[PDB]
């Protein structure tokens, strides 16, 4: 139960992975919408779980933060740098056409499959190590993925809001600024200018 | 007597008494606190 003392919704019995009874707006009242929401929630969770380290790790290294790493495309002759290497295809129209064709193909492949249970957990080629072996352990891994991904989503929100509250920052730069003086470096200064 | 209080409770009479009191009040307030485009006490 997400909120002790609160009656769980009628349609949330706790059986689903990551189902703690949280839908205060009753957005899953219709079952079709709820299933679609489980799929989409997992998609966001996995994009976030991939994108958070892609945001943090290049910052720990000498490379720019996640904001600076997008900046060459604003200027016309822009060329990307992967690990300091001016990659030749780094021009914006190149990687842009590449990204459109590749992403569009893959994601549209997800659009043209309706199991619907495979739209959440397809497996097969995407489970070569076969972690779907024990359905108990596979379901516990479902709770694992859902909580990890929700955590990553919250973290991403923290990164975007910190970026708005300190334009041209880094999550770890913000963290270090806090570690300097935690009692005088806080969200309190942003909430209260 | 009871009938007279009843008459004095009737809509137009109660209205003249009520708005006459309200007018005296607002007049005196504008007498001790004239002009005033704002609530100055903050």
């Amino acid at each position: 139960d997400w909120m002790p003392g609160q009656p769980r919704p009628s349609y949330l019995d706790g059986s689903a992975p990551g189902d703690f009874g949280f839908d205060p707006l009753r957005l899953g009242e219709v079952p079709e919408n709820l299933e679609r929401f489980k799929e989409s929630e997992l998609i966001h969770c996995r994009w976030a779980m991939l994108a958070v380290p892609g945001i943090l790790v290049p910052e720990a290294l000498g490379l720019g933060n996640w904001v600076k790493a997008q900046e060459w495309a604003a200027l016309p002759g822009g060329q990307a740098t992967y690990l300091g290497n001016p990659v030749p295809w780094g021009t914006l129209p190149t990687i842009l056409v590449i990204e459109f064709l590749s992403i569009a193909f893959v994601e549209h492949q997800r659009s043209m499959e309706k199991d619907p249970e495979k739209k959440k957990y397809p497996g097969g080629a995407f489970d070569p190590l076969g972690y779907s072996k024990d359905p108990k352990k596979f379901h516990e891994y479902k709770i694992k993925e859902v909580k990890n991904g929700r955590l990553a989503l919250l973290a991403f929100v923290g990164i975007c809001v910190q970026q708005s509250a300190y334009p041209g920052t880094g999550p770890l730069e913000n963290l270090a600024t806090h570690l300097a003086d935690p009692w005088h470096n806080t969200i309190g200064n942003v909430l209260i200018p | 007597m009871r009938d007279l209080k009843t008459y004095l409770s009737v809509a137009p009479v109660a209205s003249t008494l009520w708005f006459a009191a309200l007018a005296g009040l607002l007049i005196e307030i504008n007498r001790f606190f004239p002009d005033a485009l704002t609530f100055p006490f903050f």
Binding site: - | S9, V10, A11, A14, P34, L37, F39, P40
Partner: protein, 154 residues
């Protein structure tokens, strides 16, 4: 300042208006013996004029090129006295009146002849009910939560 205006304490046009007003009243004052009652009246209007302009200057009103106060209702905290604060006062009083009248109508609605108390006021009941308006925001909020504020299926 705000909206290109200037504080009335800093406005030449504002002070020119005060000057021309006072000199106008003094032009009227030159006609009467200084001990006379018309004279004392024009002096009272003059003192009231100075009080007016000095108060508008003090309380921070902005002026236009016209030399006249303009009100900032955007919500800027420097000017809540120009709308937001008198506005909250108004909403308190209006809510009071309407809440009391509604209390009266509910109180007489199950009488044998309801209209009878609408044209001849039950003044004792009204006096009992007038001071419910003091706490009208709590009463109306509690009714909204309890479902007693709005009639069902109307």
């Amino acid at each position: 300042d705000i909206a290109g205006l200037t504080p009335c304490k800093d406005s030449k046009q504002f002070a020119k208006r005060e000057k021309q007003s006072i000199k106008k009243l003094e032009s009227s004052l030159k006609l009467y013996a200084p001990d006379s009652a018309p004279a004392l009246a024009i002096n009272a209007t003059i003192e009231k004029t100075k009080r007016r302009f000095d108060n508008y200057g003090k309380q921070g009103l902005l002026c236009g090129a016209d030399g006249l106060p303009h009100l900032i209702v955007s919500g800027d905290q420097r000017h809540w006295g120009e709308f937001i604060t008198p506005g909250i006062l108004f909403l308190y009083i209006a809510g009071w009146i309407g809440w009391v009248g509604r209390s009266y109508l509910i109180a007489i609605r199950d009488d044998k002849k309801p209209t009878q108390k609408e044209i001849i006021i039950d003044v004792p009941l009204a006096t009992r009910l007038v001071f419910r308006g003091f706490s009208w925001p709590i009463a109306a909020y509690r009714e909204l939560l309890n479902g007693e504020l709005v009639a069902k299926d109307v």
